Each structure stands twice: as C-alpha cells, then as structure tokens.
Amino acid sequence: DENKQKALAAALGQIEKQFGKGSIMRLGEDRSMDVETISTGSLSLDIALGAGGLPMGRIVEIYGPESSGKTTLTLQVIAAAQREGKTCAFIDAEHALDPIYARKLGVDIDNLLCSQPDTGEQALEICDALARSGAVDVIVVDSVAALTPKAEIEAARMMSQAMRKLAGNLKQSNTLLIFINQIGNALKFYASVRLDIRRIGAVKEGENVVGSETRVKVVKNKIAAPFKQAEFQILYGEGINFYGELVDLGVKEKLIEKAGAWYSYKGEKIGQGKANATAWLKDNPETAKEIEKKVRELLL
Amino acid sequence: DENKQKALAAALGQIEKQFGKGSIMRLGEDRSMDVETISTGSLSLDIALGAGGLPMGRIVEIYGPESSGKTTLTLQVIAAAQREGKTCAFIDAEHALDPIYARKLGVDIDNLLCSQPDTGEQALEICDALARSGAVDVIVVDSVAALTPKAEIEAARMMSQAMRKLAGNLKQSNTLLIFINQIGNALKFYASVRLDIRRIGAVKEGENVVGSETRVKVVKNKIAAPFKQAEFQILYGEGINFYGELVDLGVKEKLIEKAGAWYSYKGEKIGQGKANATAWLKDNPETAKEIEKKVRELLL
Amino acid sequence: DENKQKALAAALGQIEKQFGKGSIMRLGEDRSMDVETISTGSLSLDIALGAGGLPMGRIVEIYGPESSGKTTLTLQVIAAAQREGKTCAFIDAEHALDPIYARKLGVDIDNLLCSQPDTGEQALEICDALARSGAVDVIVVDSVAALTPKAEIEAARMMSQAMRKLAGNLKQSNTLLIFINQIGNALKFYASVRLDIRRIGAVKEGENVVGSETRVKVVKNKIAAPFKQAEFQILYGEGINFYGELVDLGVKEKLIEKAGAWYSYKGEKIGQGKANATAWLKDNPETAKEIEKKVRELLL
Amino acid sequence: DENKQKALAAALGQIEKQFGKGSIMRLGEDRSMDVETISTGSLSLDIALGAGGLPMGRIVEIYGPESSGKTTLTLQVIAAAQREGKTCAFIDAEHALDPIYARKLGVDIDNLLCSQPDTGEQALEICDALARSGAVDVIVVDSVAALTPKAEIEAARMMSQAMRKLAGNLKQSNTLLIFINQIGNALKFYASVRLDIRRIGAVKEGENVVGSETRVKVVKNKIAAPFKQAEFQILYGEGINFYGELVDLGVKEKLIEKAGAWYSYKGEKIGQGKANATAWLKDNPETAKEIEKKVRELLL
Amino acid sequence: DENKQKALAAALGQIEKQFGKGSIMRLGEDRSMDVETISTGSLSLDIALGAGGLPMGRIVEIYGPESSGKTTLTLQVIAAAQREGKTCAFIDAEHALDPIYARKLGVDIDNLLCSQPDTGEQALEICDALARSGAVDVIVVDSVAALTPKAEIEAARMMSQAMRKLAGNLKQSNTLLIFINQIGNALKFYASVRLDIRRIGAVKEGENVVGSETRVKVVKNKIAAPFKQAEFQILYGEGINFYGELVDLGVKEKLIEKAGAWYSYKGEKIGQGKANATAWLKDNPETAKEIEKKVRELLL
Amino acid sequence: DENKQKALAAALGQIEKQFGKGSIMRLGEDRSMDVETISTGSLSLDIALGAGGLPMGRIVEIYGPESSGKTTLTLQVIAAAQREGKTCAFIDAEHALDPIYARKLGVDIDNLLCSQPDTGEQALEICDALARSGAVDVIVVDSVAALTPKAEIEAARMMSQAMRKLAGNLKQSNTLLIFINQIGNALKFYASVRLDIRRIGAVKEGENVVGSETRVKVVKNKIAAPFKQAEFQILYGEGINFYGELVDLGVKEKLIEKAGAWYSYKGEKIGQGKANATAWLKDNPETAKEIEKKVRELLL
Ligand SMILES: Nc1ncnc2c1ncn2[C@@H]1O[C@H](COP(=O)(O)OP(=O)(O)NP(=O)(O)O)[C@@H](O)[C@H]1O
Ligand SMILES: Nc1ncnc2c1ncn2[C@@H]1O[C@H](COP(=O)(O)OP(=O)(O)NP(=O)(O)O)[C@@H](O)[C@H]1O
Ligand SMILES: Nc1ncnc2c1ncn2[C@@H]1O[C@H](COP(=O)(O)OP(=O)(O)NP(=O)(O)O)[C@@H](O)[C@H]1O
C-alpha cells in the first residue's frame, strides 16, 4: 500500500525526470507546469488549458470545420499578446483576414507583421527565421491545409522536414507558434497543445442569428491535464462573449448568486436574464476583473 | 485404446510442462488457467474468455474497424479495475478520450494516469517504467496504429524491440496491458489474448439509431480455449448493455423463463419484451447480481 | 528592447533579402515597393493597392460573383494603359465583350489585340508568346473559369503546368497579366495581387436602379500591405464613379469641406449633395486633377 | 519603338503561324481571312461578320431567346446558298418548319434535304455522313436544345463526342454547318462564328405590329474581328428587311443623301421617309445591287 | 457535278441503309415508303401524309388546342379501320366519348373495345398487352395529358419507361397506335407521324355557326416528306366534310371545272356554289369514288 | 382469323385477370359485372348503368351544373336503399337539404345519419370511420366543391390524401359512397362510376313550368360498358317521373302498344297521351311492377 504509493511516486518521478514534466499525469491533478501563457480571450478555455492560456515557446495546433471560429480565436490570442506589448506575426496562406473585424477584437493591425508566402517551404522558413530572431513573441499560421509544397505548385513529408528545427528555435526564443488547420502527423506529435473547435449551435436574439454556440476540446495538453472542455459564444462582429462566460463561471464558483432569472453579486442584482447580467459586467469592468481574478485563483 | 488415452495424456502433459499450460488444449474443455482477471464489462465476453475476464500480468490486443467499440471496451475494463481499487494508466496517441462518456461508464477520471508520448519509442518506454514500478495494475495503449517511430517523425521493427522486455516486466508485476489496434506481428505472438471486434448492426428504439449490435471473437487465447464469441449491444452514451446480456444468458441457462415476449424469474414476470426485462434487472441490481453469479458458476 | 528592435530589423532584413521585399511587412507601414503601376480607374482601389495601381510584370487575379464588376474593372485598366500609349491584349473565353461600353470607358478598341482561343492550353501559350515578345504591356484573360482543357473538350493541372514559365516571361518583359475569375490554386500562389470584388448594393437616382455599390478587397498583395479595401460605384453605361470617390477622399483628407449637404473647396461651394459636388469636379477636370494629385501624395 | 513594332509583328506572326490566322487580331483591323462565304440575307450582318457572310467548311452557332429570329436567319442562309446552286440539308428536332414562309424567303423547298432524327447521336451521325460525302454545301441543325441523348429518351457529353470528328469532315469537304440553339460548351469552342440574336422592339405600321426590331452580335469570330453588331428588321411573312438596311448603310456611306425625311440618290429623290425610300430600292433592284456592291466594297 | 450527284446518292443511300428509309429525304420527292395505311377520313390530310393515311405498326401523335377536332379525327380513323374489318380499341382517360356522334361518323360502337384505366402506367400496360396480342389493329389513346402517374394519384418519366417496349410490340404486330394530346418528349421521338391540328375559323350557313374551318400540319413524318398541310371543314354532328375537299381537289387537279360559281364534271354542271357541288358528289358516291381515286393516283 | 379470335380472347382475358373485369370491354357487350346494386330511382339510368343501379362498395361521382338534379338523384338513391332496410349517411357541406321534399321522395329522414363537418379533412375522416364500421351501407357527400381544406379556412391535394384509404375501406365493407360535385382528379380515377347530369329543357303542363327534362350520361363505368345515356323528367316536389320512363321503355320494348296518342297494354287502352298512360301505371303499381320487371329482364 504505502510502499506502493512511494513506488508509484518514484516511478512517475523517474518518468518525469527522463521525458519532462507533462510526460505523464493524473487527469484530476491541480498541478500545472509553470509557464508563461497568453490568454485565448476565452475564460473557460484558459481554464480548460490548466495554465490559464497558451504556452510561450511551444507549438500549438487549432483545428476544426469551416466557420468553427479558429481565426477569431487566434485573433483574440494576438490581441491579448499585443495588449502586453508583444510582437506578433501572421503567416497567411488563406488570404481572408478582415482587419475591421480584427480591430474590433482588439488587434493592433498597424503593428502586426504579415507574410503571404509563395510555398509551404517558404512559409516554414520564414517561421524559423522569425523564431531564431528572439524578437517575435507570437506567430500564427493560417492555415496548414493551405501550405502547398513547391513541387505541387510547379505535403506530409514537407511538415516532418523542418518541424524539428522550428520547434527547437521556438523553444529557445520562447516564441509561441499556432498552426490553424481546417478539417502528415508531424504536427500532431510536435505540438504541446492541440485544440478541437466546432460550432454546436446558433445564438438567437429573438429569431435572428447573431452568434455561434462554440465548443473547444483540449485533445492534447503537455503542460497540464488534457481532455477538458470549454463552451462559449462567438458574437458576430464582436468575438468571444467573455462576460457571458464570466456570468456562468462566477455563479458556478458561488461568487455570483442566481435566483431564477435574476443574478446578483454581493447582494445587489446585476440583471435579470443571463443577457443583462452579462451587460452589467461589461459596463463595470473594474468589478468584472475582480470576479475574473477570483475565478482564476479558484480554478487555476 | 486406453494405453492410447494414457499416451495422449502424457504427451499433452509433457507439452504443457515444457511450454506452459495453455500451450495446447481441447477446444471443448472446461478447464481454465487459474488467473486473476478484470471484467471487460461484458458478461458474454467474460464468458467467451473462459477465465471470466482479461488476465493480469499479460499483454492483450483488441483490434477492429473504426467505431467498432474498442475504446468503450477498454474504458469499461478500466472502470472495472478502478472499482476494485486498482491503479490504471492510459497511454494516448489518438487524442480522442471523452471524459464525460468515460465517467458515465464508471471510470474514475481524476485518478486515471495519462500520458500523451512524443514517439512510439517513448510510449513503449513509459509503459515499461510503469510496468517495472510494481505499482500500476492496468495500462491501456490507444492506439498501436498511432505509434509513429521517432525517425518517421523527424514501425514493425520498433515493436519487436522492447516487446520482449515489456512482457517480462508486466508478467513480473502482474500488470495487465492492453494494446488497441485499428484495422509487424510481434504483438500477435506476445499477446496472451487477441480480440477481434466489430459493429454488425444498429440498435433502433423505433426508428432512431441508439446503439450498435456488437460482436467480439477471441481469436487468440492462451489462458483458455480460443475462438469463442460474444455478442452484445453498445448504447450511445451508456456503453455495454450488460443487463440485456444477462436477460439472454439467464434464459439460455434456464434461470429466467421466456414465454413469448414475457420474461419471468422465480415465477414472477419481470417484463414484456427483452427491453422491459432488461430495465427490471437494472432497477433490481441485488437480484441481478445473484443471477449473474449463477450464470458465472454455470459457465465458468 | 533596443537590441530587440535591432534583432527584429535584422531578421526582417534577412527575410526580405532571401525572399524579396514584400515577403514580410507590417500591415500599417507606409512603405510600398517601387514599381511601375497602371491605374485601375478607381481612386480608392489604387490607394488600397498601396502602389497607386496594378504592378507591371506581375500576375494579378480578380475574382468575384457574376455582375460584380470584374470586366468593367479590367476594361478601365486597359483604357488607363492605352492612355499612356501601352499595347494591350484581350484573351477571351467568355465571348461577351461590349465594344460600345468599352469605348465609353475610354478603351481604344481598334488597337486592342484580341484572341478567342480553342483550348485552355492554347490560351496560355498565346499569353506566353505575347509575354516573351517584349512588345505587349497588358494582357487580360477573361476568364479562368472558361479555360477548358483540350482533353475535356474532346483543369487544375493545366494551370500549374505553364504558370511558372508564364510568370517568368511576364516578369522579364515587365508585362502585366490579369486573370479574371468567376466565383487549382497555382494562380493563388503565383499572383502578386488578388482582388475580391462584389456588388454590395444598388445606386438609385430616385427609385430607378442606375448603378452598383461596389467593394473590392485586396486579399493578397506582394507589393504593399494587403487587406485594405475600396468602395466605389459603377454607373450603368459609364463605369467607375471616379469623381464620387474624389469627393469623399477629398473631404476625408480635409481638402474639401463638408457642411451638412454642401461641399466646398478653397472657400467656394462646389455643390449641395454628393451628386452635385461630383458633377462639379467632373466639369472642372483641371481642379479635379490637382485634388487627386493631392490625395495621392497624402495617401501613397 | 520601331524595334518594338517589329517585335510585335513577329510575335503576332509566330502566333498566327502556329495556331492559324484568326488566332489573334486587332479589333480595328480591316483584314479578313480569305474564305468562301454565304450571305445571311442581312447586309449589316454580312458586314458585321467581316467576310461578307458565314464561312464554308466551318461550324457556326446561332443562339437567342424564343422568337428572336434564329430560324428566319438560317432559312435566309439556305435560300442564299440555293440561289448559287448549293445543296442544303435541314436536320430537324423542332418539327416547326413552315414551307410557305420558307418559299417566301426564297428557299427551294422541293430540293431541300430534310431529316428528323430519333436521337441526338443519330442526328450527329447523319451530319457527319452528309459532311463526308463532299456533296452537301450547307447543313442547318434546328435545334441543339432538342437533341435529346438516346439514353435520356429510353447531353453535354454527347456533344463533345463526335464534335471533333464532325468538324474535321466539314472542313475537309468545305461544308458549312449551323447549329441553332435556344436560350456543354464543346460547341462554344469548335464553332468559328457564334451569333447572339434577340428581339429588341416591334415594328409598327401605324399601330399594328408588323415586324421585329432585331439585333445580332458576333460574340465569336475566328475569320475576322469579333464583337461587331448588326441591326435590322424582320417583317412578318417577309423575312429580313434587306432594303431598309441598304437605305441606312447607303446614307451612312454617303452614297444616298438624306435631307430631313427625303432620301435621294445621284440627285433624284427616291422617297420621303425611310419606308418609301426602301420601297424604291426594292422596285429598282438593278440600282439597289449597285449601291449594295458599293457598300460592300467600302466596308469589306 | 455528276460524280457529286453519285456521291450524294451514295451518301443518302448509306444513311437510309443505316437508319432506315425516311431517315432523310428531299421535301419535294414523290417517293413514299410502302406501308399499309388507314384513311384519316380527310382527303387532303391523307394526301398531306404522303402515304394516303396513317401507318400501321407505328405510333402517331395528334395534338392541338381544345375543340380543335382531335377526337373527331381519331373517330374517323376508327370508322375507316372498322370499315375494313379491323379490330379497334379506345383507351380513355378523358371520359367524354359521345357514341351517338361516333355512329354518325361511321364508328361501329358495339364492337369497339374500350378501357378506362386507373393510372397512366395501367393504360400503357393495357396498350402493350393489346399490342402483343397480334389481334388488335388500331389503338387510340385519349388523352396523353390525362395519363396521371400512379404516385401523383396517391409524368414525363412515366412515358419514357414503356415507350420503347410499346413501340417494339406495336411494330411487330403491325398495330397502329394514336396518342391524342391536348395543348416529356419521349412521344416526340418515338412517333413516326405527329399532327398539329387547330380551328382557324367558323363555317356559317348564313349567320349560324355550323362547323369549324380546320387546319392540320404534319410536323413530323417518317414515312414521307413532312411539313405538308391539310385544310377541311368539320360540320357539327357530321364530322369531316370529305366531299367539300373532293370538290376543291378535283378542280385543282383539273378533273372538275369551275366557271365562276358553277362547277361541272365531264361537261355537265354538278352545282352552283361549292355547297351544291358538294351535295351532288355526296348523292352520287359512285362518281365521287372515281374522282377520289383519280385524285389519289395523281397526288400519291 | 379464328386463331386471331382466340388470340384476342386470351389477351382480353389476361388483361382482365391482371386489372380486374371491367378493365377492358366491348361497348356493345351484354355482360355486366355481378354486383349488388341500389336503384337510382330512374329506370332508364339503372339500365344505362348496365347493372341496374349503382354498385355497393364502390365510389361514385355525380356532377353537373346548378339545378341539374344531383341532389334529387342522390335522395332517390337513399330512399331506395332505405326501402331495403339499409343504413344511410349524409355528409353535408352545402346546408341545403329539404326534409319535406326528401320524405316526398321516400326518404326516411328520422333514420338518416347526418354530419355537417368543419373541414374537408374532417368530412373525409368521418367518411372513413363510417366505412370501416361495416355498419353503413350508403354514404352521400354533398358536395365535393364545398369541402374547404382546413388551412384554407384558417384542395386538390386534400382529395389525393385519404382517397386511397377511403376506397379500400369502402370496398371491404361493401359501402357505396357517392360524391356530388357542382360544375384535383383523384376522384376521377378512384370512382367506378361517374355521372354527368344536366337540365335540357322544361316540362310544361300547358304553359306552367312543372318540371325539368333531364339527361344523365355515364361518362365512366367500371362495372359495365360506359357512355350510355338516360333521359327522364324531374317533377317539382315529386322527383323522377319513373312511370313516364316506364311508358316509353315499355313501348320501345314492345310490351306496351302505341297507336297515335293512345297507349294500351295486353289489348286494353291505359290512356290517351303519355300523361294519362303514366297516370294509369302509377295507379296500378302491381301491373307496373310486372312491366318494369319485364323491361329489366330484357335490357339487363
Ligand atoms: N469579418 C467578420 N465580420 C463579422 N463577424 C466575423 C468576421 N469574420 C468572422 N466573424 C465571425 O466569426 C465567427 C467565427 O468565424 P471564423 O473565426 O472565421 O471561423 P474559421 O473556422 O476560423 N474560418 P474558416 O476556415 O475559413 O472557416 C463567424 O461565424 C462570424 O460570426
Ligand atoms: N463521447 C461519446 N459519447 C457518447 N457515445 C459515445 C462516445 N464515445 C463513444 N461512444 C459510443 O461508443 C460506440 C462505440 O464507439 P468507440 O468505442 O469509440 O469505437 P472505437 O473503435 O473504439 N474507436 P475508433 O478507432 O476511433 O473508431 C459508438 O458508436 C458510440 O455510440
Ligand atoms: N454593355 C454594357 N452596357 C452598360 N452597362 C454595362 C455593360 N456591361 C457592363 N455594364 C455595367 O457593368 C456593371 C458591372 O458589370 P460587369 O463588369 O460586366 O461584371 P462581371 O462580374 O465582370 N461579369 P460576369 O462574370 O459575366 O458577371 C453592371 O452591373 C453594368 O451596370
């Protein structure tokens, strides 16, 4: 029994020592590798991630069907990074970025570096150069599916080529790199976090579709326990409904009381119906930050 | 004749003495090697296995087409093991575990160890370390097909490498290890049990598909006679329909009487139609356990 | 910090040195590759393009739904080129050119070279021949979608074939080539500029539809920052409402004052309502040119 | 400059040498491939065609809405051909030919070959047989839209099948073949001339509708510059108002003087109002022929 | 020239050999396929048909507006067939046959087979059965427009189904089948003769409307040159005015002399006014038959 | 010949075997399907029907202009049915039944079931329920034209819906159902008998209009040869003049002698003028029944 607990602890310890923390863990453990993170713009996803956001210096993959919200998510990551003064780059092979929508999400477009490479190889080489510079914090690649190999222009093999080198340089510079993928597997193994995202419904303000009910699953997580999920809405032209997540997480954590349709904080009603309570948190950011901080301290 | 019976018995005896019990047997013999087992969650499969479940300290392979039920089966093995206080590990290369579904099947997610290895070699080494610890009872690997060799990332040979060492350490610690495989052959020879599983139909509650008609064949069995089969349903979001198997096995064994569509036990009707009779056993677990125990004593 | 600025500058510099200027840039940078351009006939689009027009010696793609204005746009490019004495060619697979409308837009039909090829391959070969001649400045192909491969007559592969060779010869002769496409991806990668155009409304002179509200997005731009947009009207039988764009851009740039509905320049009213102010600029081209020149100097 | 003119000429020359004259041309050039033609019965259309009529040995397509005048046009082509002793065939899938109207247009019905095929394939095979005979000058098919494939009776693919073979044999025998089409694209590419025809108004002799104002556009022309247009009237029961076209073309070419409503030739009035002047030319065919010849020499 | 005549003859010959006589012909040729025919009751129509009547063993379609005379025509075909001892069938989906009117036209109602099918499919199957019996000479279907498909009761596709089989069996048994259609196209292609019939005026005996001026056009004719026309009257309660046609055809053929309003044959007046001359032929059938025979010999 | 008679007989036999007797027949044949019938109250109509009345278990349609006698006819059918002890139902959507007039015609109003449904669907469902009961012999629906679909209240489609089911249940219970229709076609195909009725004149007893001269045509008859007609009078407040029909039919059949205006039976005068002879038959019902029976035996 006890000696078995010690045997287990030693074994887990030796494994971790050889392959690194995160090479094995209990799915219910609170522990999370100590790493610099960048918020995803979604409170429930930062929590599902265990570390409070995406890890710096690591490779991350985000995949899902068309219109699932992959780009919105990455744009919110960029805005969050830029909010902290970090330098971001956008490697584009999709040719679909909407700067108007991006600014609405907080992205500083004027200072966003951008590249629209001729081939998959060129994209990967530009990524490595930015990684080795030690002067770029976040690199988003949209998308992997559009990274046509030079020969095919004039695939799976291309990715295995410079993936090992790219990972090494990203790690050394502490550069976060996100690959967006639309629904071979060199990315599957080199990524420290893989997110599965999809639209699971519509948000209706009466009878008009105004947003999407979204769900993200952390299918791979080398910094904290994997398989947790996040659910949130993406409002058209506005992005992730962060405050709506704050309303639910506040209640769940017993920081915000819910009596039927009326929500209240510290005794005073903040709104009838999830919609009004959300509007209230949004207009009172100072109190929202406190509640958010409280939730993070409780779940992270 | 008689001297021929004695000659046969001696020959079989010498063979067994040299290569172990299970190296040869009559397909119709009742005898089953005395071994600790872990239920598969399926009554007809535990019976098809001859020992009442999967053998501890041995390697087991479970293969079948996509959506055949391989994972559900392994998750039920884990839940059954955890129900007895055993420590389980999940080595994942598929990145598809659904903890919500897992808890529904009885899995204690919080205490399930999990690893998402970088390479096939790393997975195998983690397996060996957990085996040598003498502190892990069940290890599930999902899946073999996803165990990409390091070189291929930056196959058949990889498996033959540490398979002999892994088997030795598993045996010594009495650790059960299950390899899930999706449809070279080092696994084929080192495994003590190999299960072929597939979907042979759909379960309809009227006209809506609610489950899968499933069939498992024990193509290899070194603990008891091989080639027996098991048939059972896997209900969406619920797992193996254990009680439905109990209804049929109870009847077959003349413990439960069937008169047309009405089933009865000890004189009293328990339901009209296999569905209601199943519901009854499920709501009266204490009586179900007795009938289950009876069936096991009769067929094991 | 500073050393990080220098590290960034060096990295961007090395990238540019290896893959050419335009291989990476800040979306808010003023810099634009020094290149010969040809006006598109639209002031806001020439500005959105960053270089003041489409680049000579490069491949350009213009795509959009039916009736979005693709042809009108290309015809205005041709007229602008011919206004400077440049030799233009029209490779037609649509068989829909209206010379009456074309002359209205300024096109010199009599001197416009035209080809109506039998197959996609023949079209591409004619394009290459005109490119290699060093005697053709602008080549418009209408459209890509109508370039049926010979075999299919008696696709994606056809385009990848001679696209690399065509691009080389166009570059060497400094010949601008525009592919019109109606809504595989060899064009997507070889093009230096890709324009997304569509009708976003109707222009009504009371209650009669007289034009189309149009929007063009520069989804790909290898000569200056991509993703900018242009909005302008296309009047039936007249083409792009250049003067209407001049009214708005003049105001925006504080060159033309707007007080309610009355517009004025240098103190004197030029018209009440965007329509009259536009008419005034149109009848006073000499002053319009000055204002246009001013806007270009300010935004280019 | 000059060397650029020579470079252009050589390039155009090489293109023409490789793909044939007509593979590229200036829209304003006077040159027209030297080919045998058959008048369409319309003076402005024979001119719009550049060669003075439709080309022998080539495929021609004539399409337009219902009642646009497609059949009348083809019937006038047949009459013109028969006037020169040429053998004509009519492949019919519409079953609507009016011999009374046809004779009025000059068609020699008794000697017109006719076929009413069972399937699209049979029609095409009959066409090929007539082509290979070297004894048929003009073949009219009415219509393409009615050429139902055998299978569909007991489409796009059917046309691509024998279109290449038919074209070859027609060319070799110098047989003109016209496909009438009512508003896949194998015809679009194999045709040397494609005509778009439609009714753009009504002809009123007071308040009674007596004819149709018609417009034909040469959307494809491989024998001379494409995109020219023709406008003429089609009088009920009479066909194309040839003399009315002669009045306008004579004036335009300054062969016939117009002073208000009075027209005159060589000093003498021929009628007040376009209607009377037309009647005069019609009653004085010998002078009309001279004026017609003059116009052709001036515009062809 | 001559060799061209021989080339033409050979080509036409080969075509006829491959697709049958009637697959191509000169519209003015006297030749008519040698076939058994059944008079339509109209002398000018039997002549317009070229063979003297409708062809046995073939499918015929007769269409026209309501009250155009379609039924009267078919009833006269039946009477003519029955006059020769032929067995006739009437497949009815209109439910409007007037036996009193039918007997007046010569129809032997008592021996006319009749069917009033439940569905379009049933009608077609009954037709095939009667065809395959080799014991039915004429089948009239009234009408196609009323042949509602079974599914639609509890269309174009239905007709294409058994049309090929029906045609085969009709041909083999030499059974004439007529489809009446009121104003997809499987009938259009399988029919050997298609007749377009309509009312073009009224017959007045003073000021009272007593009949209809009728015109039939043979829009499709695979047994002789198509496109000929027939004009005759249909008197209320009497049917086709055969004798009135005989008066005109006799005159036209110079067998009957007309001097103003007086008609005469072989020197003797037979009546003043087309009406009396008709009455005379009708009361002197023996002489009428001779004149009729003469006309047929001259025009057939 | 003979073998052709046998071929015909076999073919007709096979047709009848496949689609039922009545699927084909000679219009002059005496044969009538053996079926239970209900007199229509009109002797000439029962004869025109071939079976002596309307068929039980089948659907019948009776249509005609307003005031043609449709209701009177159905009321006489009901009275005749009730005279034999049959249970009748009246489904009313017209709301115009006159019980006083009905009793005069022999209808037993007190025992007549009646329904005045809210919607067309409800009417049809009530009909089906009465049909499936096996306890209702005759159902009259007045009228189809008034069967407004539910949706239209808060048509052609409605009828096709339950017409097939209704027909099946009516047949199984041997229930006669009559649809009255006032002048889509699901009724047209499901009905076994369709009657066209209209007023063709007035009955004057001097100069006062006392009745209507009526004519019914059996346009559809699946139990015996169709297209026969019936003529009889409908006297105001009395119904069908049955005896007047008996006078004419008796004479026609040479059972009653007519010498000018005097009628006589078996030698003795029964009245001068059709009116008196009718009165005589009416006052001597016992002799009238014999004559009626005689006529039926002769014509049925
Ligand atoms: N320019 C925009 N303006 C307004 N709302 C936008 C815009 N772009 C995206 N959205 C919103 O973003 C939600 C998420 O879409 P998006 O993030 O672009 O999905 P995606 O999976 O990243 N893209 P793709 O691979 O092309 O389907 C949508 O359904 C829109 O409501
Ligand atoms: N998250 C889930 N929620 C509900 N039902 C599930 C879930 N996962 C699996 N099932 C059920 O499990 C049945 C068995 O599927 P599964 O056990 O995952 O097959 P598999 O062969 O193990 N997997 P794979 O190799 O990926 O096809 C399915 O058809 C589902 O009804
Ligand atoms: N011949 C013409 N005469 C007058 N106005 C024209 C003519 N051709 C085009 N236009 C105008 O051009 C606007 C732009 O149409 P167009 O430029 O032809 O779109 P497109 O996308 O290029 N063509 P397509 O692919 O065929 O739909 C129209 O809506 C018309 O108002």
Ligand SMILES: Nc1ncnc2c1ncn2[C@@H]1O[C@H](COP(=O)(O)OP(=O)(O)NP(=O)(O)O)[C@@H](O)[C@H]1O
């Ligand atoms: N039989 C005829 N008699 C008198 N005028 C005719 C006749 N046929 C055609 N026309 C005239 O021809 C003009 C041109 O019609 P037509 O040439 O038949 O057009 P279409 O496009 O060829 N036919 P379709 O495809 O059937 O609409 C008409 O509007 C008529 O004035």
Ligand SMILES: Nc1ncnc2c1ncn2[C@@H]1O[C@H](COP(=O)(O)OP(=O)(O)NP(=O)(O)O)[C@@H](O)[C@H]1O
């Ligand atoms: N029962 C009848 N009695 C007297 N004349 C009749 C009768 N039926 C038809 N006719 C005459 O037939 C001429 C031709 O009519 P008809 O032959 O029935 O045309 P239809 O096109 O066949 N029928 P439909 O489709 O119903 O319009 C009419 O105008 C009548 O003069």
Ligand SMILES: Nc1ncnc2c1ncn2[C@@H]1O[C@H](COP(=O)(O)OP(=O)(O)NP(=O)(O)O)[C@@H](O)[C@H]1O
């Ligand atoms: N209440 C009544 N009293 C006396 N005579 C009646 C009565 N109802 C009907 N009749 C007679 O019935 C003859 C036949 O009329 P009717 O049977 O009601 O025609 P209908 O076509 O059934 N009805 P509708 O659709 O309303 O016109 C009439 O002209 C009347 O002489």
Ligand SMILES: [Mn+2]
């Ligand atoms: Mn995206």
Ligand SMILES: [Mn+2]
């Ligand atoms: Mn699985």
Ligand SMILES: [Mn+2]
């Ligand atoms: Mn266009």
Ligand SMILES: [Mn+2]
């Ligand atoms: Mn036509």
Ligand SMILES: [Mn+2]
């Ligand atoms: Mn008819």
Ligand SMILES: [Mn+2]
């Ligand atoms: Mn009524």
